Amino acid sequence: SASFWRAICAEFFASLFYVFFGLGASLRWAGPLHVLQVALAFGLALATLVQAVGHISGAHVNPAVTFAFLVGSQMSLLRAICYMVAQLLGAVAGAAVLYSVTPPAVRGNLALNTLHPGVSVGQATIVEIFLTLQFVLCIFATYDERRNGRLGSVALAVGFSLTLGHLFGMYYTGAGMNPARSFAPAILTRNFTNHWVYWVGPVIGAGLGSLLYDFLLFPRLKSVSERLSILKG
Amino acid sequence: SASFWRAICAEFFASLFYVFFGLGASLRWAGPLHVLQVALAFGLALATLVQAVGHISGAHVNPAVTFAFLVGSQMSLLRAICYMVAQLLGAVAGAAVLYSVTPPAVRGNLALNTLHPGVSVGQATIVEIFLTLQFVLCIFATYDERRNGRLGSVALAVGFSLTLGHLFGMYYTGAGMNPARSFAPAILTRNFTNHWVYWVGPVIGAGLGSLLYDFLLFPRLKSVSERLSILKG
Amino acid sequence: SASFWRAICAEFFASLFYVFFGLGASLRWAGPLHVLQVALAFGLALATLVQAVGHISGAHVNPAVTFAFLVGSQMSLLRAICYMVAQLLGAVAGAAVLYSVTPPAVRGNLALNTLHPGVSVGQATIVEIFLTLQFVLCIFATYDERRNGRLGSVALAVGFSLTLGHLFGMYYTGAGMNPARSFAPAILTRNFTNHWVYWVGPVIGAGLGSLLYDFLLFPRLKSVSERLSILKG
Amino acid sequence: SASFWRAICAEFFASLFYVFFGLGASLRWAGPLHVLQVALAFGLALATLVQAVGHISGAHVNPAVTFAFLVGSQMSLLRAICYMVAQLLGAVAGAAVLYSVTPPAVRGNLALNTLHPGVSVGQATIVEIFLTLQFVLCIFATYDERRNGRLGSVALAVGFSLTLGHLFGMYYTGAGMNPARSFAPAILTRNFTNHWVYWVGPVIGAGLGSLLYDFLLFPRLKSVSERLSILKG
Ligand SMILES: CCCCCCCCCO[C@@H]1O[C@H](CO)[C@@H](O)[C@H](O)[C@H]1O
Ligand SMILES: CCCCCCCCCO[C@@H]1O[C@H](CO)[C@@H](O)[C@H](O)[C@H]1O
Ligand SMILES: CCCCCCCCCO[C@@H]1O[C@H](CO)[C@@H](O)[C@H](O)[C@H]1O
Ligand SMILES: CCCCCCCCCO[C@@H]1O[C@H](CO)[C@@H](O)[C@H](O)[C@H]1O
Ligand SMILES: CCCCCCCCCO[C@@H]1O[C@H](CO)[C@@H](O)[C@H](O)[C@H]1O
Ligand SMILES: CCCCCCCCCO[C@@H]1O[C@H](CO)[C@@H](O)[C@H](O)[C@H]1O
Ligand SMILES: CCCCCCCCCO[C@@H]1O[C@H](CO)[C@@H](O)[C@H](O)[C@H]1O
Ligand SMILES: CCCCCCCCCO[C@@H]1O[C@H](CO)[C@@H](O)[C@H](O)[C@H]1O
Numbered sequence: 043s044a045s046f047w048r049a050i051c052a053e054f055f056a057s058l059f060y061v062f063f064g065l066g067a068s069l070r071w072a073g074p075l076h077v078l079q080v081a082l083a084f085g086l087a088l089a090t091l092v093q094a095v096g097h098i099s100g101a102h103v104n105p106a107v108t109f110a111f112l113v114g115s116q117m118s119l120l121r122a123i124c125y126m127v128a129q130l131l132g133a134v135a136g137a138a139v140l141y142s143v144t145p146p147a148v149r150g151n152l153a154l155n156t157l158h159p160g161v162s163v164g165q166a167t168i169v170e171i172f173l174t175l176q177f178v179l180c181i182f183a184t185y186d187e188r189r190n191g192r193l194g195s196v197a198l199a200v201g202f203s204l205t206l207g208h209l210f211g212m213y214y215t216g217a218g219m220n221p222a223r224s225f226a227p228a229i230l231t232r233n234f235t236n237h238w239v240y241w242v243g244p245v246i247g248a249g250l251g252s253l254l255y256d257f258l259l260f261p262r263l264k265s266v267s268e269r270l271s272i273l274k275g
Numbered sequence: 276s277a278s279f280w281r282a283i284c285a286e287f288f289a290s291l292f293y294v295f296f297g298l299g300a301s302l303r304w305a306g307p308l309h310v311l312q313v314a315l316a317f318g319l320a321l322a323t324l325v326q327a328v329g330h331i332s333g334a335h336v337n338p339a340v341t342f343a344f345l346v347g348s349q350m351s352l353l354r355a356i357c358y359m360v361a362q363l364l365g366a367v368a369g370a371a372v373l374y375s376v377t378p379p380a381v382r383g384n385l386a387l388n389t390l391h392p393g394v395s396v397g398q399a400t401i402v403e404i405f406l407t408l409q410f411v412l413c414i415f416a417t418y419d420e421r422r423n424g425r426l427g428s429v430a431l432a433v434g435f436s437l438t439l440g441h442l443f444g445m446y447y448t449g450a451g452m453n454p455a456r457s458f459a460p461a462i463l464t465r466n467f468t469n470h471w472v473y474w475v476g477p478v479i480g481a482g483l484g485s486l487l488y489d490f491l492l493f494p495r496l497k498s499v500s501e502r503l504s505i506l507k508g
Numbered sequence: 509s510a511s512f513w514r515a516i517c518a519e520f521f522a523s524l525f526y527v528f529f530g531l532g533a534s535l536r537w538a539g540p541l542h543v544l545q546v547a548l549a550f551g552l553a554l555a556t557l558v559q560a561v562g563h564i565s566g567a568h569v570n571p572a573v574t575f576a577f578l579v580g581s582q583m584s585l586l587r588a589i590c591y592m593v594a595q596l597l598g599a600v601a602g603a604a605v606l607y608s609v610t611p612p613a614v615r616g617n618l619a620l621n622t623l624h625p626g627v628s629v630g631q632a633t634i635v636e637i638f639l640t641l642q643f644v645l646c647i648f649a650t651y652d653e654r655r656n657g658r659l660g661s662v663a664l665a666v667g668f669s670l671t672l673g674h675l676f677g678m679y680y681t682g683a684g685m686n687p688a689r690s691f692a693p694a695i696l697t698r699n700f701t702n703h704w705v706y707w708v709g710p711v712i713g714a715g716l717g718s719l720l721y722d723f724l725l726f727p728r729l730k731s732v733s734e735r736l737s738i739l740k741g
Numbered sequence: 742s743a744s745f746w747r748a749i750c751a752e753f754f755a756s757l758f759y760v761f762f763g764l765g766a767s768l769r770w771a772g773p774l775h776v777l778q779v780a781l782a783f784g785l786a787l788a789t790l791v792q793a794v795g796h797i798s799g800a801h802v803n804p805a806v807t808f809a810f811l812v813g814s815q816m817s818l819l820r821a822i823c824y825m826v827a828q829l830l831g832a833v834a835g836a837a838v839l840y841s842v843t844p845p846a847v848r849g850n851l852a853l854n855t856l857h858p859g860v861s862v863g864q865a866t867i868v869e870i871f872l873t874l875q876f877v878l879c880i881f882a883t884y885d886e887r888r889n890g891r892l893g894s895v896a897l898a899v900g901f902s903l904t905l906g907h908l909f910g911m912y913y914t915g916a917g918m919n920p921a922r923s924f925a926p927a928i929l930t931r932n933f934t935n936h937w938v939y940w941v942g943p944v945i946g947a948g949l950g951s952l953l954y955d956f957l958l959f960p961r962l963k964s965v966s967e968r969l970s971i972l973k974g
Contacts, residue, residue, distance in 0.1 A: 052492055059409050066443045074774030075307030075541075078781070079442060082311070086439040093432045094412050097422045098492055143401050143447070145393030160844030168842050176758050179793050189796045194660060194894020195427020198435070199792045202897070206785040209778060210765045214842070259751055259797055285725055292642050299676045308540030308774075312675060315544070319672040326665045327645050330655045331725055376634050376680070378626030427893060428660020431668070518958055525875050532909045541773030545908060548777070552905040559898045560878050563888045564958055609867050609913070611859030661893020664901070 046121070049099030050128050056091045056103045057132030061226050062140045063087045068153035069144065081208035084217075089201025096197060100185070105129055105221040106244030110178045114252040115264050118275035129222040137226035154227040155216040155240050163239055169214045170243020171250065173207040177219055178251030186260065219244055279354070282332030283361050289324045289336045290365030294459050295373045296320045301386035302377065314441035317450075322434025329430060333418070338362055338454040339477030343411045347485040348497050351508035362455040370459035387460040388449040388473050396472055402447045403476020404483065406440040410452055411484030419493065452477055512587070515565030516594050522557045522569045523598030527692050528606045529553045534619035535610065547674035550683075555667025562663060566651070571595055571687040572710030576644045580718040581730050584741035595688040603692035620693040621682040621706050629705055635680045636709020637716065639673040643685055644717030652726065685710055745820070748798030749827050755790045755802045756831030760925050761839045762786045767852035768843065780907035783916075788900025795896060799884070804828055804920040805943030809877045813951040814963050817974035828921040836925035853926040854915040854939050862938055868913045869942020870949065872906040876918055877950030885959065918943055 067083035070076070092101040102108040105126045112122040137152055157166045180203040183189070184196040193199070204219065211217030218224040224240035256262045264272070300316035303309070325334040335341040338359045345355040370385055390399045413436040416422070417429040426432070437452065444450030451457040457473035489495045497505070533549035536542070558567040568574040571592045578588040603618055623632045646669040649655070650662040659665070670685065677683030684690040690706035722728045730738070766782035769775070791800040801807040804825045811821040836851055856865045879902040882888070883895040892898070903918065910916030917923040923939035955961045963971070 048492055055487070055492075059405075062405065063409070063439060063443045069446075072307070074771070074778040075311070078774070078778050079307040079311050083439060083442045086435045086442070089432070090409060090413050090436045090439055093426065093429075093436075094409070094416045095492060097416070139401075139405075143394070143398040145391065148393070148446075158844065160847070161842070165842040168838075172758075172761065172838075176762070176789060176793070180789050183793045183796070192892055192895050193425055193427075193792065194892075194897060195432065196425050196792075197432065198427060199788070199894065199896065201435075202785045202900075203789045203792075206762060206782060206789055209782045209785070210762045213768075213847075254754070259747055259754075259794060281725055288720070288725075292638075295638065296642070296672060296676045302679075305540070308544070312540040312544050316672060316675045319668045319675070322665070323642060323646050323669045323672055326659065326662075326669075327642070327649045328725060330649070372634075372638075376627070376631040378624065381626070381679075426658055426660075428665065429658050430665065431660060434668075514958055521953070521958075525871075528871065529875070529905060529909045535912075538773070541777070545773040545777050549905060549908045552901045552908070555898070556875060556879050556902045556905055559892065559895075559902075560875070560882045561958060563882070605867075605871075609860070609864040611857065614859070614912075659891055659893075661898065662891050663898065664893060667901075 049121075050124050052095035052099035053102060053125050054128040054132040054135075056095050056099075056101055057129045057222055058136035058139070060087050060091055060103050061133040061136035061223055064223060065137055065153040065227060066140050066144070069148050069150060077209060077212045080212065081205040084208055085201040085205030087201075088204050089195070089198045092197035092200055093195070099125070103129060103132075104219075104223070104244075106174055106219070106248035107178060107181060109245055110182070110248040110252040112273070113249060114182070114256055114262075115269045115272045117272070119273050120275065126222075130225060133222040133226035134229060137230055141230065151231050151233065152227040153216075154231055154233060155218040155224045157236050157239065158214055161214050163236055166215045166236070166239045167243045167246075169211055170218055170239055171247035173211050173217060173219045174244040174247030175251045175254070177203050177207055178248045179255055182252060182255040183260075186262075188260070188262075215239060215243075221245070282354075283357050285328035285332035286335060286358050287361040287365040287368075289328050289332075289334055290362045290455055291369035291372070293320050293324055293336050294366040294369035294456055297456060298370055298386040298460060299373050299377070302381050302383060310442060310445045313445065314438040317441055318434040318438030320434075321437050322428070322431045325430035325433055326428070332358070336362060336365075337452075337456070337477075339407055339452070339481035340411060340414060342478055343415070343481040343485040345506070346482060347415070347489055347495075348502045348505045350505070352506050353508065359455075363458060366455040366459035367462060370463055374463065384464050384466065385460040386449075387464055387466060388451040388457045390469050390472065391447055394447050396469055399448045399469070399472045400476045400479075402444055403451055403472055404480035406444050406450060406452045407477040407480030408484045408487070410436050410440055411481045412488055415485060415488040416493075419495075421493070421495075448472060448476075454478070515587075516590050518561035518565035519568060519591050520594040520598040520601075522561050522565075522567055523595045523688055524602035524605070526553050526557055526569050527599040527602035527689055530689060531603055531619040531693060532606050532610070535614050535616060543675060543678045546678065547671040550674055551667040551671030553667075554670050555661070555664045558663035558666055559661070565591070569595060569598075570685075570689070570710075572640055572685070572714035573644060573647060575711055576648070576714040576718040578739070579715060580648070580722055580728075581735045581738045583738070585739050586741065592688075596691060599688040599692035600695060603696055607696065617697050617699065618693040619682075620697055620699060621684040621690045623702050623705065624680055627680050629702055632681045632702070632705045633709045633712075635677055636684055636705055637713035639677050639683060639685045640710040640713030641717045641720070643669050643673055644714045645721055648718060648721040649726075652728075654726070654728075681705060681709075687711070748820075749823050751794035751798035752801060752824050753827040753831040753834075755794050755798075755800055756828045756921055757835035757838070759786050759790055759802050760832040760835035760922055763922060764836055764852040764926060765839050765843070768847050768849060776908060776911045779911065780904040783907055784900040784904030786900075787903050788894070788897045791896035791899055792894070798824070802828060802831075803918075803922070803943075805873055805918070805947035806877060806880060808944055809881070809947040809951040811972070812948060813881070813955055813961075814968045814971045816971070818972050819974065825921075829924060832921040832925035833928060836929055840929065850930050850932065851926040852915075853930055853932060854917040854923045856935050856938065857913055860913050862935055865914045865935070865938045866942045866945075868910055869917055869938055870946035872910050872916060872918045873943040873946030874950045874953070876902050876906055877947045878954055881951060881954040882959075885961075887959070887961075914938060914942075920944070
């Protein structure tokens, strides 16, 4: 039904907003102030967007997040691909629109995710993994219909999880936690240096999060039947 | 019924508070610290006011927000006009009372919304549009009775949306997102320079937000019948 | 019943905690950083305490707040007096315990509420009034059983209202919004300079808040009968 | 049942995350900025983890917290021991993994809890006690099934309680409030100087919190029967 294309649209616009506001708030340099401010910006961007379209598409706005739900057998392979496609175009569009209204000199590299001189790509990949792992874990747990009438706003919980990822990570890798968010700055600045970290960390972390939740913490046992039936629809 | 004049009163007082506390917290200059602090101040002012009178008038406290609900066919043309009237007088009053208790030298221009030297009014109008668009989108989605028992506090969600608007926007336009909030400082400092941006951006953004929500994301299909019946009451 | 002395105890301990953590976090000087940090500290202290004992005593932890509920005919004159008595002793105790574990030199004046050189006591009284007014207004609205299943945490709403009061007020009067919180530092430092502001502003603001809510925004019509019956119990 | 080993696993992973992100965000020095940022980091780490596994193990992720529930007769002596065991190994593991991905020079002492030169260990023990006391009090009150449909997110309430503990405490003792969180940095840096404070304060505070809640504020009267029956299972 049209109850599918609306979601794809939700994922496109939300991703454009997420990157537009996220990157926009990161322009400049610096420091606690800097980190604190950028951590809150991405976090509140997500909390806002999750309230805005979480009921419509589940507000993934993140390829690694969508990948998590795929292996978690909660969405079809067809939906996953489109979500990720919409997320990549949306992100690029947000970065594009951001570039068009931002004064040069302040533009910098459009907040491209970058490693710290003293951090190896191996350590950086492990960082991005842990960041995305606690992040996806919070998403799965709070989206789980099987629990709590005392959750409060799941939109904010997830947003603050993203903020926590930044408060810690920015010092190491600028905190990617999202392939699409990393990709947009890279494709427009023509700089794919160390970009592998920002696809690998999140995907693996997202993978370990889903697995850890569904197959150990609070098992959601699906029969091989449904798995394929779902991965198909 | 009197269940109409109470709301108008709600919109008047809330607007006076919103501008009084919002502007008051913006006095001085500066920087992350500055932005972070002012972003939180406006955001918590709104979250507070939405809890205070959201059940009474819907706590619009914003002309662009009210305009959104008009074209969204959720209020009558009569209510909209009064809301906006109460919001403009309330704002001016808040700025007035703020001026009366604030020491000169610190008064400055009473936190008048201003463009960044390197930002064209065109880019500034597009910024204000995006700010108000994600803002109204969050308002519509969270006010929508058709969803979530996991929303948490809608008052805070909207407040944090406003904070996010500031964390990004202040650098560009000081972040207006609200004609009344922009108007009060302008009418009292007799400075309407670039004021057009602060009416145009929000109204258009607010317009694109409502449209995007009601006519694409989660359609609330009203028959031409009701539309006019509502725009009339 | 004992369902009365537990509350008095709740108000005593909560007040000791509120002042202990509130004042403790205010030691030193300074600035956004300073204000932001102290605003959040008092705010989260209250949100925490409101969750801790709001179900037991309503977590007033504030004389002006209790006064609001008295004139609001929601508590007896006997309860009000004891609450305020417990709040004053609790506060002093918190400031006392704070003094005993804090290094001198850092102690300063134990975060005594103070006016800004350029702010007259008249302007300062009006500031404290507005601060306490939006504060009590948020308390009444969120405590009102007659509304919302979308409130979220009322504990946090009220806490953030207090934070907003500080983000704006600290620059003017250090933000009292609470006679007991102002009193404790004064009685122990033997400095009652301008102390009148910190009793007068809140009480009046608290008074205008209750009146504004119960007699205009969302009238809670009590017959003269009940009023006295309540003010008596 | 396996509905026991999953919890132990929950407590292990959550503790590893808590310390990994908590300590990681504390690396460097400094100041409001520093404190504010670290306070929020620990706070959001907990809020995140409480949402992630609070429904599975109750998300204690803290020996003093678990001890509180033991004397509160809410868990068996067998569960308590394992929880604390999982929490200690998890913490050490988190600090270990943190060390492996962090650049030296920035590593410092891995955010080891430390006293302020002007604070005696006696004053420091009293500080840690008060910090953990308001903390456990908030945990008990918000976990109490006997109350509120207006709590909002208990995960966030507890997290913000931890943040408040840091906003005040870091200046005194770096804010331990958690034996496991203090232990991990100590065992790996081979520095147990003043470590006694970080086990004694929390345990006592946690003890006074439970007692204060269950035996005075909102008594949860258990017959000697059940107490032992519970402490046994
Ligand atoms: C879910 C997977 C979790 C993996 C946790 C691994 C912890 C050990 C990390 O060792 C680090 O490996 C880097 C190369 O990758 C080296 O450059 C670095 O010096 C070394 O300290
Ligand atoms: C599970 C599928 C994961 C796919 C991840 C794709 C990451 C994009 C690759 O970036 C690579 O970075 C290297 C430096 O590190 C560059 O030398 C190389 O030219 C560039 O292509
Ligand atoms: C919902 C409407 C969204 C519109 C998005 C428009 C993106 C392109 C913006 O282009 C900008 O236009 C400015 C004038 O307006 C020029 O001064 C500036 O140099 C140019 O880069
Ligand atoms: C949908 C209706 C929108 C109405 C918007 C009204 C905005 C107020 C106009 O401000 C204008 O700003 C110009 C500079 O930019 C000044 O030269 C001009 O004198 C001043 O009047
Ligand atoms: C609910 C009550 C609201 C009252 C609002 C009053 C607004 C006008 C404030 O005027 C101020 O009065 C001070 C003395 O009090 C003077 O020192 C100051 O120069 C003057 O500007
Ligand atoms: C509704 C009842 C309100 C009661 C308020 C009592 C406030 C305490 C008085 O402080 C006063 O401050 C003056 C300077 O301003 C000092 O000169 C004076 O000696 C001191 O006593
Ligand atoms: C739940 C228990 C609460 C206990 C509260 C105690 C408050 C009094 C603290 O006195 C302090 O004791 C320190 C040694 O411990 C001395 O070094 C310090 O100079 C002294 O001021
Ligand atoms: C309720 C049980 C509480 C157990 C608390 C154990 C705390 C660990 C002890 O740290 C101690 O710190 C001293 C300096 O202060 C060192 O001299 C001593 O060598 C070291 O062992």
